[PDB]
Every structure is written in structure tokens, then in C-alpha cells.
Amino acid sequence: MVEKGKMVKISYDGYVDGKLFDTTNEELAKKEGIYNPAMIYGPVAIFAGEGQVLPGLDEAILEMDVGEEREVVLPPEKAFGKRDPSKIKLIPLSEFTKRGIKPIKGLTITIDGIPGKIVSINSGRVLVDFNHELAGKEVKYRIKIEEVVDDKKNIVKEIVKMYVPRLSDVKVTIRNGTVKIELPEFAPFIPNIQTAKMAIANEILKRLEDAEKVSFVETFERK
Amino acid sequence: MVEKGKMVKISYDGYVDGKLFDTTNEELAKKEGIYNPAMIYGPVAIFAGEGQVLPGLDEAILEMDVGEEREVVLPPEKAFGKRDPSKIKLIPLSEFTKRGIKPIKGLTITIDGIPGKIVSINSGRVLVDFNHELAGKEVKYRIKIEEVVDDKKNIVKEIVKMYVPRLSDVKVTIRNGTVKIELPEFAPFIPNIQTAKMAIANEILKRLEDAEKVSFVETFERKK
């Protein structure tokens, strides 16, 4: 069993109706058609049982051990939630034609700034589902606990990556109460890096009781 | 003389037709009415002869010594430019009325943002002068070279202040071609501080040719 609040690194592959919809395995993601060039793959760090993942995943993780691999089946209540009937709405077909849109099943459209999926067309009404795509669905996860991170240096490294995935190679130095974090050359250019830094620092101070301060170093070279 | 590229701190008072329009002196800006709460006054650092001041003013500085003070009368070509006759145009009066504007002679208005002074109104036509306000005017400066900033540490500090006036108190250390700048507690919250930091680093690396890197240190304390 893994204790609530423990930082763990996990790998997983998430299936719905036989199909892979999410994974930390880059190669598999490629093989299976869902690869996102913006996403950073590989094992992910979470604080166990704190709500960083699906509730059913949090529950499964807390009863596993390090090195343990496992497959869990989660009901919608524990995954992406039940399908709310209030979010499935009949919209007059004229609302589409007037805008020059041919409604087709599976088309994503937006109404009032809210996205929905076209579910069916009958007579002069288009049924559009504004629920989460995986709402009401049972989902399966391959999950493995890769490691427990219990050293200060790596807790900090992982907290940084948790808040900013692209920052996977930061240099951390613990010096009696001071957490020094040297950032890569590209870091200063990250959108709202400053908010991110403050969040990272706040997370570090919460986890490392002996830390008095968190100091970030940004370096600009002759490039 | 001062060499081009040298950092100097200067103090000055600028005059048009005998009236003060620009200054580094806090009190003299208020007493004369030209004060602006968003401006940090006092000696300001420039790089000599690089166009951070009016051209007539740069060229004076290049021929001055540290501590020297002099009056410099600048012709329009070296100040805000010469009056350009092609910028004084006849505009149909209907252009004003369409915009809800009442045109009065001598009274500055804006047309589509761009401001202008109404010279006259005649037979459904408005003659508007769109020259810079101080165009064609001779301006007179009282300028003193307060100090030359010659030492690496103060060059860095002044560069910081040049880009972000509020960062007047930073800790600087230089070791093995690395310039380290430790920032105060409020630094990370400054608007567009990331762009300011790259700007400061660029300037530092330009001025200190022995520098290989510029490092900024931001520190978050245990609510303190």
C-alpha cells in the first residue's frame, strides 16, 4: 500500500470500448494514433490520493506497491462522471443552416461558447451532447507504480515538472533551508512562467518542511 | 570629451520659448506644473551618443567632461524636427461634424487618434496642423554630466534601473564571466519582467564583453 500524500511516479494506458484514449507511453501513443506533439510523455508524478488523477485511479494507487502493475475498471462515477441529460439538447436545424453548417454525426460545434458533439439528426432537430466525451462511460487503465520519490532533490525536480512538464531537466541544489532551482535557457520564455514559479515554490514549501526558501535561477547566454 | 558607448548619468532642464517642458528635477517639475506621477526623476543613466536623448543633446555630451555643466541651444533639426509644411492640411468641415467635434481655432483636437492644431476654419474647410507640437522650435537645455559609470558592478545595477526604474536595489556579484543579479522579493510580480530581464541581459552582454552569462535570482520565502 502507498500512503496518501506520498509522491509517486505512475505509467498508464487508458482504454474506452476497446480503444486507447490516453497513455504515458510515447511509442504506444504513436502506434495507436493519439500522439500529441504538445504533450510530454513518460512516467508522471502525483501526490497519491490527493485528486491529481481520476478518483478511481487515486483509489487504485493507494492500495498498490512500488513496481506493481495492474489493470482497473472504473465506473463513470469514478472516472469522467455520469452523462447529464440536461446537457443533451435538441437544437433547431435552422440554427445550423442559417450559419452555413451541414450538421453531421460526430461534428463538434460550439453554442454560447460551449462545445458539444452532434449526436443525431431527426426531422428539423439536431441533437447535440454538451457532456464530457467519456461521460457515462466505463474505462480501463493499465497502471504501474514506477517509483516512490522520497528524496528532497527529486521531489523538487518532480514538482517543477508537475507544474511545467517541459521543464524536465532542471538543476536542483538543496543548501540547508534553501532550494535552488536552475532553469534551462528556454524557461524565461514560457507563458506565465512567473505564476508557474510561484505555484512551484508554494508546492515545495508545503512538501519540504525544512525549506525556508525557494530561489529560481534564470540564465541568459551568448547564443 | 566622453567616448560613445560610455555610460554616464546626466541631469538636465529643457526649455521651449522660455518655459520648462522636461526635467530630471522632481521639485522643479511640480513647481512648474509638468510633474508626472508615473515618472522616476533624478539623475538618469544613458549610453553617450546612442540616441537615448535628442540628437543635439547626445552630441553635446560627447564633447563634455564628467562634472561639466553647460547650456545647449538646439535647432529644430537636432530637437523635435523642422516644421513640415506638407503636414498642415485642409480637411472638410464635415469630417469634424461626422465625429461630433466642434472645431475651434487654436484648440488641439484629434482626428482618428492623430492629434492636430486647428489653425483656421474657412468656407467649409478646416486647416489643421499635424506637425509634432515642438516642430520647428529651438529648444534649450541645461545639461550636466553628473558621473561616468565605469565599474562593472555599477554598470549592471544602472542597466537594471535603466530598464526597470523600480529595481533600484539589486544585489550583483561577478565571478568567472558570470554576472549574477539577485532580485528583490517583489521582482517576480512586475508586469513583463521576463521581457525586461532579457532586455537587461542583452544590454549587459553588449557592455561587458568579458561577460559570458547573466543570471537572475528570484527568491520565494516561507510567507515572509
Domains belonging to chain A, first-starting first, are 1-87+132-149 (3.10.50.40), 88-131 (2.40.10.330), 150-223 (3.30.70.2210)
In B, minimum Cα distance to A193 occurs at B194
Q: Give A205's contacts in chain B (Cβ within 8 Å).
A: 220, 222
Stated resolution in angstroms: 2.2
A189 → chain B, closest CA residue:
B194
Is A212 in CB contact (< 8 Å) with chain B?
yes
Tell me the chain A residues in contact with residue B212 when contact means C-beta distances shorter than 8 Å: 221-222
Cα separation, A80 vs A138, in Å, equals 9
CB proximity B120 to A under 8 Å: no
**A220 and B214: CB-CB below 8 Å?**
yes
Work out how many CB contacts closer than 8 A connect A with B. 58
Is residue B221 within 8 angstroms of chain A, CB to CB?
yes
In 3-state terms chain A splits into helix, strand, coil percentages (rounded to 5) of 25, 35, 40
Q: Give dist(CA B69, CA B61) in Å, integer.
A: 10
CA distance to A96, B106, B124, per residue, from B94 (Å): 44, 19, 8
- Name which of A205, A215, A218 is nearest B197 (Cβ-Cβ): A218
From the list A103, A105, A104, A107, the residue with the least C-alpha distance to A94 is A103
Residue whose C-alpha is closest to residue A205's, from A177, A182, A164, A183: A177
Measured distance CA(A49)–CA(B102) in Å, rounded: 69
In this complex, do B198 and A220 lie within 8 Å of one another by their Cβ atoms?
Answer: yes
Are B172 and B132 in contact, with CB atoms under 8 Å apart?
no
**Cα dihedral B52/B53/B54/B59 (nearest 10):** -90
Decide if B217 and A221 are in contact by the 8 Å CB cutoff.
no
